[PDB]
Design a protein around this ligand. Structure first.
Ligand SMILES: Cc1ccccc1COc1cc(Cl)cc(-c2cc(-c3c[nH]c(=O)[nH]c3=O)cn(-c3cccnc3)c2=O)c1
Ligand SMILES: Cc1ccccc1COc1cc(Cl)cc(-c2cc(-c3c[nH]c(=O)[nH]c3=O)cn(-c3cccnc3)c2=O)c1
Lengths: 303, 301
């Protein structure tokens, strides 16, 4: 029993974190085989930041402009190139701790684990969702750039996020590991705002199932609804639309539970229209939207 | 900026997790140097749970009755002893991944990370606190016994919790790594009510300081309070008493923010009285009590 915001075990990623310094800029790199990946803004000075020409900034640098430290040892940089917003530094020695891995780009509403790092050294791990507005509500300080987010499947690390910047509102923006930004953001110090965020409906449903699985079921009711009817309510409360795909995804949770997805939508509809106020769910006074259906299955099944 | 329930990176502990089986009973062990630590109730059958005599059950076992599996490898048990409610299995190979470590017994209100495991393999990691009633509010299923809680201030792992059992209320009980239970509990399937679960007041204060550090002050007010008057009020909400030790401990956060500890106590008294009125603090609609003063300074600056 119990339900907590749970991160993947981070051991396989901790072995890949290094420090990357170019001039006076220092941040984290991800060392896999003989390449270190990090944000391309490492090659910026404070003033470059305001309007960088990354082509020209990198044309001016050579391999010896980059210091890469794996804890105590120095990795000799023997090559460099940019892929989109990520710098790739070829080093002279392959990481003996490289895990089975692949680079994957996630959709908004998917969750992942963040290994927050400073000076190449892991300092904490926590669980995040890619918001519908493509930001993530992380916990990052200066020096955290290059920290990565990931999921684990069996024995394969799927890297999905690299940290690049904090927006003025205090939320965070980054890329996949091929350097493609999530969201309409640019790696430049210039005014930019995320769109208005929404609530990840399918994840709220998942968490309500987690509540039922844990014996918390005061919010169930005799009613059902239609996808079409529910989405009228959802749109009005800034909830993401619920799709037939979402219904299917929730299948195994409805099985594991005995509550049909459109039945649970009827409970969520009432929670939106009337609140809960008096009561809590799974120890929360808010409707939690950073657990996916699979998150719930894996935590409640012991995967 | 931002503020999350952050756990320590679990790699150093993952490399210590093994599976221990005795008869039909299987759980996790912690493999440090040439010893595997696990809950002694691994030697119980379903029929032994109501009134186990562990000394009698253990004397009937030989080393080869304990099957220890590290990944794909079977570790050979060459000896065994019982220390309080933990079993120590000596094995013939020391763990090459053993981190720098120590055992520490923690106090109520302290936080730690949990690496939840099944069959010696990690499921996930999350952050917990030792409740005032000496339970923890974990996320644990059958087979999770032997999972451990830890901190890693610097590069040394401090093991502070081993998971033993789930109470009928759905909260969890276990031991330090010397096998002494936290709280009055016993590794036996008998009734054992946990005390009232009160709120960790000093942690709630640290967390309000976290909110100020991160730029939010809406909940402060113009009042102060005596410590005595604060405690008289707060205990009516089942908040733990705040001691002068807690007040001293909050000194550093008080200094960074410019908010006297008893002025933040006044704000807390008013939050209990008023609730949030539709607002949130650090993304929560409830007052959060599983961040310590030490956690806040670690995460915020
Ligand atoms: C987006 C926006 C809009 C208006 C005004 C300002 C902005 C912000 O604009 C940028 C652009 C870029 Cl390209 C990078 C950054 C950035 C750099 C650094 C950094 C620099 N120098 C080091 O040596 N190490 C480092 O980590 C760190 N953080 C950071 C800080 C805290 C949490 N999370 C991340 C950055 O956000 C910021
Ligand atoms: C305390 C109390 C009071 C009144 C009624 C019941 C109770 C509970 O009484 C005990 C006593 C003991 Cl000594 C152990 C357990 C227990 C065993 C097992 C277990 C067994 N058999 C395996 O093969 N592997 C295993 O992990 C697993 N869980 C467990 C289950 C879920 C989460 N967390 C832990 C136990 O709580 C239970």
């Amino acid at each position: 029993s119990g339900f907590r915001k749970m991160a993947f075990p981070s051991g396989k990623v901790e072995g890949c974190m290094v420090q990357v310094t170019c001039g006076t800029t220092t941040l984290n790199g991800l060392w896999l085989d003989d390449v270190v990946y990090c944000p391309r803004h490492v090659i910026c000075t404070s003033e470059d930041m305001l309007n960088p020409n990354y082509e020209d900034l990198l044309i001016r640098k050579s391999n010896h402009n980059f210091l890469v430290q794996a804890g105590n040892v120095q990795l000799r940089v023997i090559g460099h190139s940019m892929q989109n917003c990520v710098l790739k530094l070829k080093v002279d020695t392959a990481n003996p701790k490289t895990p089975k891995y692949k680079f994957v780009r996630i959709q908004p509403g998917q969750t992942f684990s963040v290994l927050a790092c400073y000076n190449g050294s892991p300092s904490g791990v926590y669980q995040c969702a890619m918001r519908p507005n493509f930001t993530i509500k992380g916990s990052f300080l200066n020096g955290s750039c290059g920290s990565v987010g990931f999921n684990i499947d069996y024995d394969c690390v799927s890297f999905c996020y690299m940290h690049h910047m904090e927006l003025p509102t205090g939320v965070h923006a980054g890329t996949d590991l091929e350097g493609n930004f999530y969201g309409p953001f640019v790696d430049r110090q210039t005014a930019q705002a995320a769109g208005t965020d929404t609530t990840i409906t399918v994840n709220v449903l998942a968490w309500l199932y987690a509540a039922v699985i844990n014996g918390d079921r005061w919010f169930l009711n005799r009613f059902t609804t239609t996808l079409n009817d529910f989405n009228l309510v959802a749109m009005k409360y800034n909830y993401e639309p619920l799709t037939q795909d979402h219904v299917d995804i929730l299948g195994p949770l409805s099985a594991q539970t005995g509550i049909a997805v459109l039945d649970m939508c009827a409970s969520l509809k009432e929670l939106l229209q009337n609140g809960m106020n008096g009561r809590t769910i799974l120890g929360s006074a808010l409707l939690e939207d950073e657990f996916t259906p699979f998150d719930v299955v894996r935590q409640c099944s012991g995967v």
